Amino acid sequence: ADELVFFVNGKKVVEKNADPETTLLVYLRRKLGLCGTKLGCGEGGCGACTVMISKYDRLQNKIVHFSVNACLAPICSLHHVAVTTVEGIGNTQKLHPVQERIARSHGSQCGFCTPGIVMSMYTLLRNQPEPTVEEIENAFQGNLCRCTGYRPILQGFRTFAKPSLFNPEDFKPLDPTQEPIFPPELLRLKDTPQKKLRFEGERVTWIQASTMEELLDLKAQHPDAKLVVGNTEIGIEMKFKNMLFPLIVCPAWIPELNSVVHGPEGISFGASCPLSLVESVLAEEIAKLPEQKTEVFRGVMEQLRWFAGKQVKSVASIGGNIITASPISDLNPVFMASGAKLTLVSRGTRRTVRMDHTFFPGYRKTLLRPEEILLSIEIPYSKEGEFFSAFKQASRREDDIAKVTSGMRVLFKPGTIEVQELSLCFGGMADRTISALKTTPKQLSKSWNEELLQSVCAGLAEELQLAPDAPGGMVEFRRTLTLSFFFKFYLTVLQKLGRADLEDMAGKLDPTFASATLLFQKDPPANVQLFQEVPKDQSEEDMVGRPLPHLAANMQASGEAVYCDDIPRYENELSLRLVTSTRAHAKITSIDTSEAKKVPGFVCFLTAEDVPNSNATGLFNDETVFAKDEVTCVGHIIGAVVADTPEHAQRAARGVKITYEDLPAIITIQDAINNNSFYGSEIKIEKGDLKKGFSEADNVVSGELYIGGQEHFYLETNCTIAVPKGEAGEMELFVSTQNTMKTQSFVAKMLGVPDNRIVVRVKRMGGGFGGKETRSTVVSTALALAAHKTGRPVRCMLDRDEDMLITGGRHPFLAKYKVGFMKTGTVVALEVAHFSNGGNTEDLSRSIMERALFHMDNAYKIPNIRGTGRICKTNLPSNTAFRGFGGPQGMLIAEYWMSEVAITCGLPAEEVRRKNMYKEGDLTHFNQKLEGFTLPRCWDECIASSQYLARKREVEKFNRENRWKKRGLCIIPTKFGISFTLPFLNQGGALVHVYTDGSVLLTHGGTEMGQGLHTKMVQVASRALKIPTSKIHISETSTNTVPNTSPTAASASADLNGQGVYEACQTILKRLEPFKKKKPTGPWEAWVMDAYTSAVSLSATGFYKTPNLGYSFETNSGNPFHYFSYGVACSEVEIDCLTGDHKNLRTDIVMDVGSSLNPAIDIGQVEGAFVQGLGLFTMEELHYSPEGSLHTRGPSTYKIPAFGSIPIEFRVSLLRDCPNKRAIYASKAVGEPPLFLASSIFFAIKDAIRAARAQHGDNAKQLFQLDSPATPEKIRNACVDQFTTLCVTSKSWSVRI
Ligand SMILES: Cc1cc2nc3c(=O)[nH]c(=O)nc-3n(C[C@H](O)[C@H](O)[C@H](O)COP(=O)(O)OP(=O)(O)OC[C@H]3O[C@@H](n4cnc5c(N)ncnc54)[C@H](O)[C@@H]3O)c2cc1C
Ligand SMILES: O=C(O)c1ccccc1O
Ligand code: FES
Ligand code: FES
Ligand SMILES: [Ca+2]
């Protein structure tokens, strides 16, 4: 047959013309309008698209449930399966416990990921009714969240396993019986033998083989037939490497390729077995068999522990991992280094082989003949006197690509410690999986002793050398790892020999080298949130200062909250796709649409010619809407393809051929300095006398810190929907932005119509953090022009690779400091020269650099200081705002030389800091008096509650007992100024309406992206009008209701809008008091009607502007801030000196948010900001080619904090009794300040690294270089030792920007 049949949320679905290229994600959103399931990457790493799927296991005669990635599952593979999505488990009317909990525990912010996480937890509970705290966490390996900081999510879900922010005592019980039945129709079908299905598509044919005979026969007749199972590999090739296999064939049904046979030599799994099957089956073996027969099994298991996540492993097969033949495969190494027996069948033919250097001929190739297919794999039992180990190291533990992976085996002569057989296989060292065929033989018969260790290391170092210009980069780090892995193996093997009586022969192991053999250990979380209780009085209706859940939590948790792309398409609507340059600075000589036009559905290709009025946009008018004559960065927008479906828009854009003539490019900060290529003159602040200050300097340190950039990674990429009104140049735009005003102004200026005609509407954003403060417009305008030219509605949702490439991000920094200080610690002179890489457009760069300079002093009084800034005009995607807006960069530099001051002085950091810290009443370097100073209490409470001193000791102790595992514990302070650097942007407006039924419709200039701004504004209004929040509502933000609004940024949004909403509300109360006075206790509904029937207006606007702001650089005077945010973080880490990986063991925060408008919201903002910082300083790295082209374009190569990447012990506390009167209800901004506190982790790692360096004889300087981010690479290399030494022996892949 050719009719695809399956279920979704219970309802049957029959598809008569299924296209192999159609993914369950597209079929759910665009063919069933089920939009709970989101699209965050289409790469497989965020899990926003997670959905459960069920089916009847023919074999086990049972129904099974497992999660999967909708973005990668081809529907042509879902025949006779039951899909379940977030919508299918609950609604706001009837929330499923999973949804209720995540929502109430505050686990949802922007909400764009809650459906996926909800589904992972849901799927778990369907498999394990009462999971363990550990099982719960493993559920989220394939799920990423950028707003929550993961604490709440897990704390909330904890309740399912084994004052206050919420109450699990109120959570509704779970009832497994009340879950969606399993489609009886599907059980009726399990009675008739499945047959072969064929699905013809627009350009791809898919055959679903049902029997081995069919499969081999098909391969025989058409060897070209591409096999597909989980598609987790092929899916990526088609989607990202622009591949197209016209003839697929899925054999997932065939029994043979699914059997698990227990043989004498070991367990044989069919080539199609899901990695989750292998995982579960082996896990049972290593639990009932002698530890001596499960060495290899446990090796595989260790790899799978960090192999994608639940979603991928549920469909990814073993055979797929084998045949993919990826040099970075984490299983081929283990399979080769253990001689796995692979069977290979073909119609008529049948052979068998063992994995070895011969199996992987060249790049991604194997022994298999074009017509053969991998039948099965036998994972061998470990023989007595045989030991195995598996290693893997990347940039992040959870779901990542290995930099180096390895499988190591050793077989000793019976009863001895003499090497009978030794295999060492690696991944990430060549264009394939290799073995140390040379090094290992020269080790036969030798004994497991220190001499062999030296023999191998020297051998590996020689045999596995890398070309400095080798692909991937990080040459040193990788080499070190091959050696560091073997070292762990050597130390491990010893322990195993000792644990066999031959202890005496191999020799006891140093009790400080033991930890170096340990496998990664979990250790249960322990969080503690602390905030103030609202006065004993405060009526229960006054929610200001109460932990009120984000108003949209339930909706976000249920998939009903709507996001731009969720809005349905007009039958009308067209799709748009941007066309960017592939040259950093060329001259466009010719554009060719010839091919684009052949694409079915092609409407047109917009260029600079098609712009009605002006082609000059951007916050400083130095940018083009569409490149004209020359491109000035890779990812520069040249045009826009317009077609019906997004699929055709893309294929068409690919048909737009361009020709260039390159020009001198200015890629790096250096390139810029050498070319005097900047954005304006240099900014400078200076107080005191430098020469004089340096003269009195006992010490004087110089240095250069470099801070990497950072991609915002809002789960919801950029999206705009433009609907043309047909008359007067009227246009409504549904946009994911934090800046309606400029989105509007840019579309107006671009079209040639007044702002009169343009309306921009923002309901909510799935995260923004400054990335949508002005860069969204680059998409907005393109669509506006598509609408204005077709008359039809046009829409554009950017894919991740396009968003990351195009939208820019945080500013990379280069500091050149020279601090002068006394032996006492006291600093007396500072001089920093910052250099930010601005990019293609000025944008907000120069204002970011002004913020940096404003915080180069972090928390310290420095009598003689002078900082300067220069913004580099480079041929790269222009960079913008990012939570912190230059503040972190400027503070990381400050805390860097500060740390080196402590070291050089030999004094304890805490003391060096407390000494130089500001005092209540001091002026800053820009002369702003610091009144209501509160940092000291944050400091004294943090040391006290985090029990610093005592733990400082426990850390030293741990270090004395551990050689290849060191711990750090650093306490950092921060000072963040609140207000826009541009004074007039400090204004907010609101519009309130009270209808005759009493209900109130409120709106303000600020947008919503996860911060819970509306929730707060609602709480403000509710307290202002003295009526329950239940009667108030905010539906969206738009230029209709409130005009000329500042972008939602600078943490000020709740300060500005909250003040506006307040005034508006006071106007209403004014009007209403005459009626109130008459009937004092009469209901609110009553006063409203009276006012109405008395012709009294029940609608008013509210406005506010921050007073007394205004700073002059020319005279270094005038306060540029309304007030200051204050806080202290105390983090503890524990690095693995042998790999670079580490783990944040504990953090303690004490933040000053004045009288919090909403404790729960703020604490969630503190945790979230922090985790964003922790990623900026230790995980997130962007790599650009030498030619200025970005390489890291998806979560696969950009690793943002994951679930397990957060302080195992997260403690947050809000400073008590610290009312900030001058702000809405004595509160304080809280969105950005908390982010730099993640520094404490950076410098705790600094310590742990120094402690390791201190036990290595060779001095080689004590004040080493540790640039940001402190990735595994930077950390390992910094731990110079016998291994970093024996392996350090242009044309490189990347380059420092
Ligand atoms: C987010 C994410 C994270 C990942 N993490 C990791 C990781 O940590 N380590 C790692 O190694 N991989 C990882 N992978 C890669 C991938 O999941 C594996 O390579 C997977 O095991 C491939 O299996 P599949 O069934 O999905 O293959 P498919 O994509 O269906 O097929 C892959 C290739 O195998 C061939 N093939 C499949 N079965 C057979 C057979 N029986 N006989 C002959 N040829 C066959 C096909 O022709 C095709 O070329 C990740 C992928 C994603 C998307
Ligand atoms: O001044 C700004 O424009 C600004 C923007 C985002 C965040 C903080 C800021 O000061
Ligand atoms: S979209 Fe499918 S994993 Fe992120
Ligand atoms: S709350 Fe999850 S991506 Fe924002
Ligand atoms: Ca810029």
PDB file of N, CA, C and O in Angstrom, residues 142-188:
ATOM      1  N   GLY A 142      18.281  15.831  26.687  1.00  0.00           N
ATOM      2  CA  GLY A 142      18.066  16.366  25.358  1.00  0.00           C
ATOM      3  C   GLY A 142      17.217  17.617  25.367  1.00  0.00           C
ATOM      4  O   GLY A 142      16.773  18.050  24.314  1.00  0.00           O
ATOM      5  N   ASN A 143      17.008  18.199  26.545  1.00  0.00           N
ATOM      6  CA  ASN A 143      16.181  19.394  26.687  1.00  0.00           C
ATOM      7  C   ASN A 143      16.950  20.576  27.244  1.00  0.00           C
ATOM      8  O   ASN A 143      17.531  20.487  28.316  1.00  0.00           O
ATOM      9  N   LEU A 144      16.922  21.695  26.530  1.00  0.00           N
ATOM     10  CA  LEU A 144      17.629  22.894  26.960  1.00  0.00           C
ATOM     11  C   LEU A 144      16.664  24.019  27.310  1.00  0.00           C
ATOM     12  O   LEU A 144      15.615  24.168  26.677  1.00  0.00           O
ATOM     13  N   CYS A 145      17.010  24.793  28.335  1.00  0.00           N
ATOM     14  CA  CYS A 145      16.214  25.937  28.740  1.00  0.00           C
ATOM     15  C   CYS A 145      17.195  27.057  28.998  1.00  0.00           C
ATOM     16  O   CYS A 145      18.213  26.869  29.671  1.00  0.00           O
ATOM     17  N   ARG A 146      16.871  28.233  28.476  1.00  0.00           N
ATOM     18  CA  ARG A 146      17.734  29.393  28.582  1.00  0.00           C
ATOM     19  C   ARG A 146      17.298  30.443  29.583  1.00  0.00           C
ATOM     20  O   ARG A 146      18.002  31.427  29.769  1.00  0.00           O
ATOM     21  N   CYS A 147      16.161  30.242  30.241  1.00  0.00           N
ATOM     22  CA  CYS A 147      15.660  31.266  31.163  1.00  0.00           C
ATOM     23  C   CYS A 147      15.634  30.900  32.622  1.00  0.00           C
ATOM     24  O   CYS A 147      15.927  31.734  33.471  1.00  0.00           O
ATOM     25  N   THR A 148      15.239  29.665  32.908  1.00  0.00           N
ATOM     26  CA  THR A 148      15.075  29.211  34.286  1.00  0.00           C
ATOM     27  C   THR A 148      16.296  28.910  35.149  1.00  0.00           C
ATOM     28  O   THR A 148      16.252  29.107  36.371  1.00  0.00           O
ATOM     29  N   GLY A 149      17.383  28.446  34.534  1.00  0.00           N
ATOM     30  CA  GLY A 149      18.542  28.095  35.326  1.00  0.00           C
ATOM     31  C   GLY A 149      18.261  26.714  35.903  1.00  0.00           C
ATOM     32  O   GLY A 149      18.883  26.273  36.869  1.00  0.00           O
ATOM     33  N   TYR A 150      17.273  26.050  35.316  1.00  0.00           N
ATOM     34  CA  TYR A 150      16.879  24.701  35.687  1.00  0.00           C
ATOM     35  C   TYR A 150      16.513  24.373  37.132  1.00  0.00           C
ATOM     36  O   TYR A 150      15.833  23.381  37.377  1.00  0.00           O
ATOM     37  N   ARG A 151      16.941  25.170  38.099  1.00  0.00           N
ATOM     38  CA  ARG A 151      16.608  24.806  39.464  1.00  0.00           C
ATOM     39  C   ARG A 151      15.126  24.498  39.679  1.00  0.00           C
ATOM     40  O   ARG A 151      14.765  23.346  39.968  1.00  0.00           O
ATOM     41  N   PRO A 152      14.247  25.518  39.530  1.00  0.00           N
ATOM     42  CA  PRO A 152      12.806  25.334  39.724  1.00  0.00           C
ATOM     43  C   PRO A 152      12.262  24.103  39.028  1.00  0.00           C
ATOM     44  O   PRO A 152      11.565  23.300  39.639  1.00  0.00           O
ATOM     45  N   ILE A 153      12.595  23.936  37.757  1.00  0.00           N
ATOM     46  CA  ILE A 153      12.092  22.779  37.048  1.00  0.00           C
ATOM     47  C   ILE A 153      12.322  21.535  37.890  1.00  0.00           C
ATOM     48  O   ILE A 153      11.360  20.914  38.348  1.00  0.00           O
ATOM     49  N   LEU A 154      13.590  21.192  38.126  1.00  0.00           N
ATOM     50  CA  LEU A 154      13.935  20.015  38.934  1.00  0.00           C
ATOM     51  C   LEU A 154      13.360  20.043  40.358  1.00  0.00           C
ATOM     52  O   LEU A 154      12.807  19.043  40.827  1.00  0.00           O
ATOM     53  N   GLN A 155      13.479  21.164  41.061  1.00  0.00           N
ATOM     54  CA  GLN A 155      12.939  21.188  42.412  1.00  0.00           C
ATOM     55  C   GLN A 155      11.482  20.789  42.365  1.00  0.00           C
ATOM     56  O   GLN A 155      11.018  19.996  43.189  1.00  0.00           O
ATOM     57  N   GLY A 156      10.765  21.333  41.382  1.00  0.00           N
ATOM     58  CA  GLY A 156       9.362  21.021  41.235  1.00  0.00           C
ATOM     59  C   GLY A 156       9.119  19.566  40.912  1.00  0.00           C
ATOM     60  O   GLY A 156       8.301  18.921  41.565  1.00  0.00           O
ATOM     61  N   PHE A 157       9.815  19.035  39.912  1.00  0.00           N
ATOM     62  CA  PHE A 157       9.605  17.643  39.533  1.00  0.00           C
ATOM     63  C   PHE A 157      10.067  16.651  40.590  1.00  0.00           C
ATOM     64  O   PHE A 157       9.664  15.487  40.576  1.00  0.00           O
ATOM     65  N   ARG A 158      10.914  17.118  41.501  1.00  0.00           N
ATOM     66  CA  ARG A 158      11.442  16.280  42.569  1.00  0.00           C
ATOM     67  C   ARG A 158      10.298  15.526  43.249  1.00  0.00           C
ATOM     68  O   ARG A 158      10.411  14.333  43.530  1.00  0.00           O
ATOM     69  N   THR A 159       9.196  16.236  43.482  1.00  0.00           N
ATOM     70  CA  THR A 159       7.997  15.699  44.129  1.00  0.00           C
ATOM     71  C   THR A 159       7.469  14.400  43.530  1.00  0.00           C
ATOM     72  O   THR A 159       6.680  13.709  44.160  1.00  0.00           O
ATOM     73  N   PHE A 160       7.898  14.066  42.320  1.00  0.00           N
ATOM     74  CA  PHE A 160       7.459  12.834  41.672  1.00  0.00           C
ATOM     75  C   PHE A 160       8.335  11.642  42.048  1.00  0.00           C
ATOM     76  O   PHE A 160       7.920  10.493  41.897  1.00  0.00           O
ATOM     77  N   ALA A 161       9.542  11.922  42.535  1.00  0.00           N
ATOM     78  CA  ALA A 161      10.536  10.890  42.844  1.00  0.00           C
ATOM     79  C   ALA A 161      10.560  10.099  44.149  1.00  0.00           C
ATOM     80  O   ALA A 161       9.758  10.297  45.061  1.00  0.00           O
ATOM     81  N   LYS A 162      11.542   9.195  44.189  1.00  0.00           N
ATOM     82  CA  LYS A 162      11.850   8.310  45.314  1.00  0.00           C
ATOM     83  C   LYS A 162      10.634   7.674  45.936  1.00  0.00           C
ATOM     84  O   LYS A 162      10.174   6.665  45.359  1.00  0.00           O
ATOM     85  N   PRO A 163       9.763  31.990  54.256  1.00  0.00           N
ATOM     86  CA  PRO A 163       8.576  31.623  53.443  1.00  0.00           C
ATOM     87  C   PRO A 163       8.971  30.628  52.351  1.00  0.00           C
ATOM     88  O   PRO A 163      10.114  30.169  52.313  1.00  0.00           O
ATOM     89  N   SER A 164       8.033  30.294  51.466  1.00  0.00           N
ATOM     90  CA  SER A 164       8.310  29.344  50.390  1.00  0.00           C
ATOM     91  C   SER A 164       7.853  29.908  49.052  1.00  0.00           C
ATOM     92  O   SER A 164       6.972  30.764  49.009  1.00  0.00           O
ATOM     93  N   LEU A 165       8.449  29.429  47.963  1.00  0.00           N
ATOM     94  CA  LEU A 165       8.082  29.909  46.635  1.00  0.00           C
ATOM     95  C   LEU A 165       6.808  29.241  46.136  1.00  0.00           C
ATOM     96  O   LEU A 165       6.069  29.811  45.331  1.00  0.00           O
ATOM     97  N   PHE A 166       6.551  28.030  46.609  1.00  0.00           N
ATOM     98  CA  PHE A 166       5.346  27.330  46.215  1.00  0.00           C
ATOM     99  C   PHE A 166       4.962  26.283  47.246  1.00  0.00           C
ATOM    100  O   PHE A 166       5.503  26.274  48.348  1.00  0.00           O
ATOM    101  N   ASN A 167       4.024  25.407  46.906  1.00  0.00           N
ATOM    102  CA  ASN A 167       3.587  24.405  47.864  1.00  0.00           C
ATOM    103  C   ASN A 167       3.192  23.084  47.214  1.00  0.00           C
ATOM    104  O   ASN A 167       2.081  22.936  46.716  1.00  0.00           O
ATOM    105  N   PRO A 168       4.101  22.097  47.231  1.00  0.00           N
ATOM    106  CA  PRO A 168       3.878  20.771  46.648  1.00  0.00           C
ATOM    107  C   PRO A 168       2.788  20.024  47.390  1.00  0.00           C
ATOM    108  O   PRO A 168       2.289  18.999  46.929  1.00  0.00           O
ATOM    109  N   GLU A 169       2.439  20.550  48.555  1.00  0.00           N
ATOM    110  CA  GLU A 169       1.390  19.975  49.386  1.00  0.00           C
ATOM    111  C   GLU A 169       0.053  20.200  48.676  1.00  0.00           C
ATOM    112  O   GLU A 169      -0.903  19.457  48.884  1.00  0.00           O
ATOM    113  N   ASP A 170       0.009  21.221  47.820  1.00  0.00           N
ATOM    114  CA  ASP A 170      -1.193  21.553  47.062  1.00  0.00           C
ATOM    115  C   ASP A 170      -1.229  20.954  45.661  1.00  0.00           C
ATOM    116  O   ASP A 170      -2.218  21.110  44.951  1.00  0.00           O
ATOM    117  N   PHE A 171      -0.159  20.284  45.252  1.00  0.00           N
ATOM    118  CA  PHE A 171      -0.126  19.671  43.928  1.00  0.00           C
ATOM    119  C   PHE A 171      -1.172  18.566  43.872  1.00  0.00           C
ATOM    120  O   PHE A 171      -1.329  17.810  44.827  1.00  0.00           O
ATOM    121  N   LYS A 172      -1.894  18.471  42.762  1.00  0.00           N
ATOM    122  CA  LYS A 172      -2.904  17.433  42.644  1.00  0.00           C
ATOM    123  C   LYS A 172      -2.182  16.099  42.477  1.00  0.00           C
ATOM    124  O   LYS A 172      -1.173  16.019  41.791  1.00  0.00           O
ATOM    125  N   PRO A 173      -2.680  15.041  43.125  1.00  0.00           N
ATOM    126  CA  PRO A 173      -2.075  13.710  43.040  1.00  0.00           C
ATOM    127  C   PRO A 173      -2.042  13.245  41.605  1.00  0.00           C
ATOM    128  O   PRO A 173      -2.707  13.823  40.765  1.00  0.00           O
ATOM    129  N   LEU A 174      -1.268  12.207  41.322  1.00  0.00           N
ATOM    130  CA  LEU A 174      -1.196  11.677  39.973  1.00  0.00           C
ATOM    131  C   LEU A 174      -2.067  10.432  39.936  1.00  0.00           C
ATOM    132  O   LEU A 174      -2.207   9.742  40.944  1.00  0.00           O
ATOM    133  N   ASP A 175      -2.660  10.144  38.784  1.00  0.00           N
ATOM    134  CA  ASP A 175      -3.517   8.972  38.656  1.00  0.00           C
ATOM    135  C   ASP A 175      -3.282   8.316  37.303  1.00  0.00           C
ATOM    136  O   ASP A 175      -3.965   8.613  36.332  1.00  0.00           O
ATOM    137  N   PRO A 176      -2.301   7.410  37.224  1.00  0.00           N
ATOM    138  CA  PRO A 176      -1.950   6.699  35.994  1.00  0.00           C
ATOM    139  C   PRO A 176      -3.112   6.182  35.147  1.00  0.00           C
ATOM    140  O   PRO A 176      -2.971   6.077  33.933  1.00  0.00           O
ATOM    141  N   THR A 177      -4.243   5.851  35.777  1.00  0.00           N
ATOM    142  CA  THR A 177      -5.415   5.333  35.047  1.00  0.00           C
ATOM    143  C   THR A 177      -6.089   6.385  34.164  1.00  0.00           C
ATOM    144  O   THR A 177      -6.690   6.064  33.140  1.00  0.00           O
ATOM    145  N   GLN A 178      -5.978   7.643  34.570  1.00  0.00           N
ATOM    146  CA  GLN A 178      -6.565   8.745  33.835  1.00  0.00           C
ATOM    147  C   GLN A 178      -5.678   9.241  32.692  1.00  0.00           C
ATOM    148  O   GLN A 178      -5.627  10.438  32.419  1.00  0.00           O
ATOM    149  N   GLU A 179      -4.994   8.324  32.016  1.00  0.00           N
ATOM    150  CA  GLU A 179      -4.114   8.706  30.918  1.00  0.00           C
ATOM    151  C   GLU A 179      -4.718   8.184  29.633  1.00  0.00           C
ATOM    152  O   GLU A 179      -5.398   7.167  29.632  1.00  0.00           O
ATOM    153  N   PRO A 180      -4.469   8.877  28.518  1.00  0.00           N
ATOM    154  CA  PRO A 180      -4.990   8.491  27.212  1.00  0.00           C
ATOM    155  C   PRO A 180      -4.829   7.020  26.910  1.00  0.00           C
ATOM    156  O   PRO A 180      -3.744   6.462  27.025  1.00  0.00           O
ATOM    157  N   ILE A 181      -5.939   6.401  26.532  1.00  0.00           N
ATOM    158  CA  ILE A 181      -5.980   4.994  26.180  1.00  0.00           C
ATOM    159  C   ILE A 181      -5.014   4.795  25.018  1.00  0.00           C
ATOM    160  O   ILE A 181      -4.620   5.754  24.365  1.00  0.00           O
ATOM    161  N   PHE A 182      -4.617   3.559  24.765  1.00  0.00           N
ATOM    162  CA  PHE A 182      -3.749   3.298  23.636  1.00  0.00           C
ATOM    163  C   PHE A 182      -4.690   2.851  22.511  1.00  0.00           C
ATOM    164  O   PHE A 182      -5.342   1.810  22.619  1.00  0.00           O
ATOM    165  N   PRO A 183      -4.763   3.626  21.417  1.00  0.00           N
ATOM    166  CA  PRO A 183      -5.614   3.367  20.246  1.00  0.00           C
ATOM    167  C   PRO A 183      -5.989   1.909  19.984  1.00  0.00           C
ATOM    168  O   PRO A 183      -5.244   1.178  19.335  1.00  0.00           O
ATOM    169  N   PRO A 184      -7.166   1.474  20.463  1.00  0.00           N
ATOM    170  CA  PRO A 184      -7.610   0.090  20.263  1.00  0.00           C
ATOM    171  C   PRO A 184      -7.465  -0.363  18.822  1.00  0.00           C
ATOM    172  O   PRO A 184      -7.227  -1.540  18.555  1.00  0.00           O
ATOM    173  N   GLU A 185      -7.614   0.573  17.890  1.00  0.00           N
ATOM    174  CA  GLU A 185      -7.487   0.242  16.475  1.00  0.00           C
ATOM    175  C   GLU A 185      -6.106  -0.346  16.218  1.00  0.00           C
ATOM    176  O   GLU A 185      -5.953  -1.280  15.429  1.00  0.00           O
ATOM    177  N   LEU A 186      -5.103   0.210  16.894  1.00  0.00           N
ATOM    178  CA  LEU A 186      -3.730  -0.250  16.746  1.00  0.00           C
ATOM    179  C   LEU A 186      -3.552  -1.674  17.244  1.00  0.00           C
ATOM    180  O   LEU A 186      -2.749  -2.427  16.696  1.00  0.00           O
ATOM    181  N   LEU A 187      -4.299  -2.049  18.278  1.00  0.00           N
ATOM    182  CA  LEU A 187      -4.210  -3.409  18.791  1.00  0.00           C
ATOM    183  C   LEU A 187      -4.930  -4.353  17.835  1.00  0.00           C
ATOM    184  O   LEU A 187      -4.583  -5.527  17.737  1.00  0.00           O
ATOM    185  N   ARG A 188      -5.940  -3.842  17.134  1.00  0.00           N
ATOM    186  CA  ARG A 188      -6.679  -4.659  16.178  1.00  0.00           C
ATOM    187  C   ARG A 188      -5.771  -4.990  15.005  1.00  0.00           C
ATOM    188  O   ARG A 188      -5.834  -6.085  14.448  1.00  0.00           O
TER     189      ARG A 188
END
